[PDB]
Design a protein around this ligand. Structure first.
Ligand SMILES: O=C(Cc1cccc(O)c1)NC1(c2cccc(F)c2)CCOCC1
Ligand SMILES: O=C(Cc1cccc(O)c1)NC1(c2cccc(F)c2)CCOCC1
Lengths: 304, 304
């Protein structure tokens, strides 16, 4: 037992990280088969980032202007194309460490692991959630651009995120691996504000279930509620509304703990209204919303 | 910017994980060069665990009683020996994925990454600290035995922990890779209680520095203190006493933020005395003690 914010093992992704250098600008690329995927802003000077015309900037770049290094060996670039906000660099060598993989666009509230990288070299791995405002709260220094987010299903890496920028508020924005931003953000050096960072209610409930499974039971109350009554409280506290789809996905936790989903909602309602009163749940003084119901089942059952 | 509980990239360790089966009992082994390291309680039946005589139990085991599987290939066991609470199984094949490595015994307050594994297969990676009572607060289900803790220095994996058991309070105990328990615990199924889980003050201070570096500044106050005055407050709050050695190691953070260590101590003193008043620091409602000063520098500078 015990319950930890856990990332996927990163080895399969470590084997895919490369350094991409265009002009004097370097960041990370993802090498899968004979393609290297990186943020298109690799082509841009600091002056370019103010108001970049990526199509016009890219005209001035040839295959030989994209320097791709995997470990300390140079890959030969035989083609390049822009797909939305990512560049695809065709190389003459298939990555021999290519895992089974997919590109998936995730929904807000979904969690994934980030392999933070600098100059094509992995620095660390951490777990986060796509926020309801389509930002993530990462740990990214200058140079971490091209770092990717992923989930693993046995031997299949589903890549869901590529890091592109930090908003003036220090939160992070990026793309799926087709180069489409999450949310409304643009890869331009202009002030961009995020919407309301609401709490992922279905994830809090999953984590309350994990707490019960792990023996933190003090917050369980004598009450129940309804979806409509709960959602009145959710809205007041900038929690995402709970739907029957979210009730469905908490079923096995409901079943294991013999705690009806709406009873756990009524427990969460009192926690919102009363606070923690200086108490903790699974070592947290706040309600954790970066575990999905699938994450809680996975961790609580030991999937590899 | 942004500040995350970050694990080392786990690939170098993933390449070392194997399954070890003795009698009907399976758990994880660490394959380095031509040796597999696993908890000695692999030899034990459920009845054996009540009061095991490992020397006597091991007499009944031959090399061919230790089944070592790496992926889906069987390694040939050509020797076995007990070193304290670990078994060393000599195999006829050097692990071709052996990283540069060392065995280190860490001190309380030191952080490391755990690669949680089941049946020799990695499930997840998370960061934790050796508690001052020589326990760790992990995420370990039955079968996670042999899972290891490590730090990485560029290309060198320093292995510091091997998971052996869960205490009745759901906290975790284990050994260094020489098989010596952290703390007073024994690999026997008998009720064992942990001492006071005190807060790692030097780590809280490092994390307060990380908060300042990342723009969470609200807790900075107009006060300073002395080591003796601070330590009076530390003791009252079950914080570890702060020494000049801990002051030394917070210097670069002191220097970067222009916040004298004793000023940050005076800020921590008020936080202890006043609480957070419903506010948060780097997304936490409690004071985080699982980042060392080295962790904070590493993350805040981007070492790979
Ligand atoms: O995100 C930032 C801001 C930033 C820079 C440095 C330190 C910070 O704390 C924040 N700058 C880059 C960027 C800007 C605009 C669109 C875009 F796609 C990428 C360009 C420089 O490389 C990193 C990404
Ligand atoms: O730690 C536990 C207790 C435990 C078992 C199951 C579920 C729990 O939540 C807790 N049992 C094992 C053990 C006991 C004593 C010494 C020792 F070295 C190892 C033996 C069974 O395998 C796992 C380790």
């Amino acid at each position: 037992s015990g319950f930890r914010k856990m990332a996927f093992p990163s080895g399969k992704v470590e084997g895919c990280m490369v350094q991409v250098t265009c002009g004097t600008t370097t960041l990370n690329g993802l090498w899968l088969d004979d393609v290297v995927y990186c943020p298109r802003h690799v082509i841009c000077t600091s002056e370019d980032m103010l108001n970049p015309n990526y199509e016009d900037l890219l005209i001035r770049k040839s295959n030989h202007n994209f320097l791709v290094q995997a470990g300390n060996v140079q890959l030969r670039v035989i083609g390049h194309s822009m797909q939305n906000c990512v560049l695809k660099l065709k190389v003459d060598t298939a990555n021999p460490k290519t895992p089974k993989y997919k590109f998936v666009r995730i929904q807000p509230g979904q969690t994934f692991s980030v392999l933070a990288c600098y100059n094509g070299s992995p620095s660390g791995v951490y777990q986060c959630a796509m926020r309801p405002n389509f930002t993530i709260k990462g740990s990214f220094l200058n140079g971490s651009c091209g770092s990717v987010g992923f989930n693993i299903d046995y031997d299949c890496v589903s890549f869901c995120y590529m890091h592109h920028m930090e908003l003036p508020t220090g939160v992070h924005a990026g793309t799926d691996l087709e180069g489409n931003f999450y949310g409304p953000f643009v890869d331009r050096q202009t002030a961009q504000a995020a919407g309301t960072d609401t709490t992922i209610t279905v994830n809090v409930l999953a984590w309350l279930y994990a707490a019960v499974i792990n023996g933190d039971r003090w917050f369980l109350n004598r009450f129940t509620t309804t979806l409509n009554d709960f959602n009145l409280v959710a809205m007041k506290y900038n929690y995402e509304p709970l739907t029957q789809d979210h009730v469905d996905i908490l079923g096995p936790l409901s079943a294991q703990t013999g705690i009806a989903v709406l009873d756990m909602c009524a427990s969460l309602k009192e926690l919102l209204q009363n606070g923690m009163n200086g108490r903790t749940i699974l070592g947290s003084a706040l309600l954790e919303d970066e575990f999905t119901p699938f994450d809680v089942v996975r961790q609580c059952s030991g999937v590899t």
